[PDB]
Design a protein around this nucleic acid. Sequence first.
DNA 1: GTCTGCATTCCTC
DNA 2: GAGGAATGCAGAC
Length: 674
Amino acid sequence: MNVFRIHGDNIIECERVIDLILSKINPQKVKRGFISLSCPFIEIIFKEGHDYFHWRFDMFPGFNKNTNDRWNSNILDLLSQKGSFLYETPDVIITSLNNGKEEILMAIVFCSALQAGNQAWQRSGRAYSVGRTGYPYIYIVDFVKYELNNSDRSRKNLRFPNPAIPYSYISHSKNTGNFIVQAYFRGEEYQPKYDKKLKFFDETIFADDIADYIIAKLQHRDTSNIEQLLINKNLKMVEFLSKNTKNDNNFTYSEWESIYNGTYRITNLPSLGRFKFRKKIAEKSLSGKVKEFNNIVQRYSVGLASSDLPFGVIRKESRNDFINDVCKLYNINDMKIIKELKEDADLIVCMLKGFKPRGDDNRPDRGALPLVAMLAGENAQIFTFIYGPLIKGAINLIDQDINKLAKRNGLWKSFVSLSDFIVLDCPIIGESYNEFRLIINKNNKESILRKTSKQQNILVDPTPNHYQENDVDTVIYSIFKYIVPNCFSGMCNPPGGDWSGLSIIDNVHEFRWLSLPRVSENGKRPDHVIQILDLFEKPLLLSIVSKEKPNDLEPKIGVQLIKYIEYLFDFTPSVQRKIAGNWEFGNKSLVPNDFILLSAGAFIDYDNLTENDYEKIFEVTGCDLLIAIKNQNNPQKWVIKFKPKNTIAEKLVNYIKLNFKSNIFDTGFFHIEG
DNA sequence: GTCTGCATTCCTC
DNA sequence: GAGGAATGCAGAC
Ligand SMILES: [Cl-]
């Protein structure tokens, strides 16, 4: 037998990897259950012709935020040990268990939509940091999903990321020698007959290639050829994007192609200089000598990928003059500092506001230097210019020990790890005029790029410090997705809903609402929506919220869950398909009176609730059902108590009790009190 | 309070 | 109008 672990942010992310495997593997036997209270498993017997395989996948939901926060050891330490120095967490890590320890096979990130603008690089630190470890980094995204005006669920026009973002994965792969890729799955809203922006999309960009790659990695087989097919699709996405943008201020596909095939490097393109680097700065952001610094950059710079990306190049042939102008502007007279600035090499200049008016850091700026390092290499000389307001404590730490600031803040960690020179021309909150700093960070950057955490083997123990909201979620998901409907995968019975979308089925169609907001005017997005069709004359939609403790259930949460479903019913489903037949745009609106809507709050309670406490929770939340869960340690069991508010919820409880049976799931790990 | 994930409006060209 | 600049809310701690 072979055992693999799937460490995920939650049970849904873990199960997405299992669904990808089950899309290519058709198993002879499937068994589900728990290896511990927190860790569900799926066991499969399958064959490749005459060759049988027996695999078990043990799932670890909820990552640690430190070394012993939830789990006794942090699986993420395996990434820090290989050079992942940014505080970055993927969605899933898949490991192989051998000789009492875990070995990472890959890191996977799932994204619902191809993000655009600075949101495209906001989390680029993940791909950069995990990419430099040698462990494969797979970014999977749906192409396309429409952004909506939440007021009326009307679709906004499609926006695409700058072609340099998808390209960065390709360049990061080449620079490191590791497999870092962006893969695209056909979204339900990919409808090219209704949107002219998709006219030239090559449908061969859509990735069985991801399931093939995962299975070949699980089998310890050669994946070089599958990797090339995926890289080819990533490149064809850059082709689609660059051929749809204007060539005057952006790299053309033939320029990207000449970099990809190794003819030229991104800084030695023969056409470099046809557009300059022109950073756009809002007039309200200006202070000190920022405008004059931007003029000096635009006097010497050559564009890198796009004229208005927040970075560009100062070629070594112009570096002396650029440095003389900066030194004259900021009164830098120190002979030794000027020599450091005048090193005879190309200089990447990155310009970022960094901070909002109250000195709180810009999230998108965290990915700017990782994006530059993925495109140009981490050893490229980077001059980072910051002009946003700094709180007094931040400039104080810059003057005492910049690494102290980098240790506590992700933005400062990105700046300090990747910049050779950090220049600040910042307003200081509480003071009338800007502060100027010129930090020679070369030696510090070099030290960070060699740093790795303590080498040590990891075997995460399946018993966490304590049981909390991740465990409540795993239990709720297992009961309503596998035990009560009698399913073994995500592709089964009514799909229901979660944070990523809501599906409602009938006798002929599956209707789906995509792009669900966290809140509506009177509603809150449920953690899970369960559809039950064999209980009442009308179908039931059970909306559930999961919390660590009963007092974490907010006032009117039960009513808000129902009102969220009522909000969706006020609009045509995003997409629909015939359960017998392809996804199309939603055509017909659904009727709420055709459904019974109930709400439920789930939590962990160690028998600290009286009849009056339960009465108070019902009054506060308005939930139709409360699900009180508690673990028993000897023998390990989850004891479930279903508390109905009314007669309708009581019928649901009796239904759950009657159907708490399964040929696939080991229900023996549960005890339903009533 | 701070830090980070999430995602929408603002502003320059 | 395109698309990067800029911005804040929320949850978790
Ligand atoms: Cl093309």
